[PDB]
């Protein structure tokens, strides 16, 4: 564009000008700097050097891991990390400039496209699953009640991992998966909120000093939350209630004996 400006300045005399001879040099070296065939070649290169097998990695849907950290844990992983960007790369080169793009890579990208959304849903389900497990095991009481749903999620996770590449039955598993983890997540969120209301009452049992009406009110509210727990039944709800009641008895008897002495 700047060259066009100078082409307008003198027409042809700007070329062999007093300083246009140097402008021409700056432009020529800058053209050699601005080259993309090197990048196109490196792209087709790398993709044809190691992404020849990266393309159709759709079979082994699930893959266990190893993560050298404290304890050296292992996670779950689906095999679609750079491939999706390669699909976008091909579409960009084709619509953008258009080359004699390697047709084999284009058709392998096509095969990745026709199975890609499934993998997206699976990957997000896995990530949400991991996030929920983080929240769950960061707590400890919750495990008692979540136990059933957590086993449910892992039941379908086991049924999903066990199979790899089910060309016929894929979509229903994906949808089942999404709803299970979706429910699961809502249950953890729901329970978290419930528990904190419970604990504000529990931790407030030493606040309203010696008023049976208020005590009664607190308890009623707490078990309203307990019927909420009953409906969407969690796992071992009465057991956790036994725990509650024991500590409630202790806060009660403690407030009692304190007031007993004062009275």
């Amino acid at each position: 564009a700047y060259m066009k400006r100078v082409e307008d300045v003198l027409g042809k005399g700007w070329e062999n000008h007093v300083e246009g001879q140097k402008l021409k040099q700056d432009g020529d070296s800058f053209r050699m700097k601005l080259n993309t065939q090197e990048i196109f070649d490196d792209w087709a290169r790398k993709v044809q050097q190691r992404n020849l097998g990266v393309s159709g990695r759709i079979f082994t849907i699930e893959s266990t891991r190893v993560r050298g950290r404290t304890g050296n844990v292992l996670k779950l992983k689906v095999n679609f990390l750079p491939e999706i960007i390669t699909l976008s790369k091909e579409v960009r080169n084709l619509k953008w400039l258009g080359f004699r793009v390697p047709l084999a890579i284009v058709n392998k990208a096509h095969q990745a496209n026709q199975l890609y959304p499934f993998a997206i849903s699976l990957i997000e389900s896995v990530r949400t699953y991991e996030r929920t497990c983080e929240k769950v095991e960061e707590r400890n009481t919750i495990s008692l009640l979540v136990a059933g749903l957590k086993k449910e999620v892992q039941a379908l996770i086991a049924e999903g991992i066990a199979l790899v590449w089910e060309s016929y039955k894929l979509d229903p598993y994906v949808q089942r998966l999404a709803e299970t983890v979706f429910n699961f997540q809502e249950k953890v969120d729901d329970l978290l909120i419930i528990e904190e209301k419970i604990d504000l009452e529990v931790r407030s049992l030493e606040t309203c000093m010696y008023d049976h009406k208020t005590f009664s009110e607190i308890l009623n509210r707490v078990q309203k939350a307990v019927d909420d727990l009953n409906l969407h039944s969690y796992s071992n709800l009465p057991i956790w209630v036994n725990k509650l009641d024991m500590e409630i008895e202790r806060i009660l008897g403690v407030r009692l004996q304190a007031g007993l002495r004062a009275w």
């Binding site: 266990t64 844990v73 292992l74 996670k75 779950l76 497990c133 095991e137 495990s143 008692l144 136990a147 059933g148 957590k150 086993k151 892992q154 996770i157 086991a158 991992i161 066990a162 796992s235 071992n236 057991i239």
Partner: peptide, 21 residues
């Protein structure tokens, strides 16, 4: 007196790894 149910995470995962063959 049931001691109904409770499970793990990492355990189930690597156990399925051994089940992957």
């Amino acid at each position: 007196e049931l001691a109904a149910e409770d499970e793990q995470v990492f355990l189930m995962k690597q156990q399925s790894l051994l089940a992957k063959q």
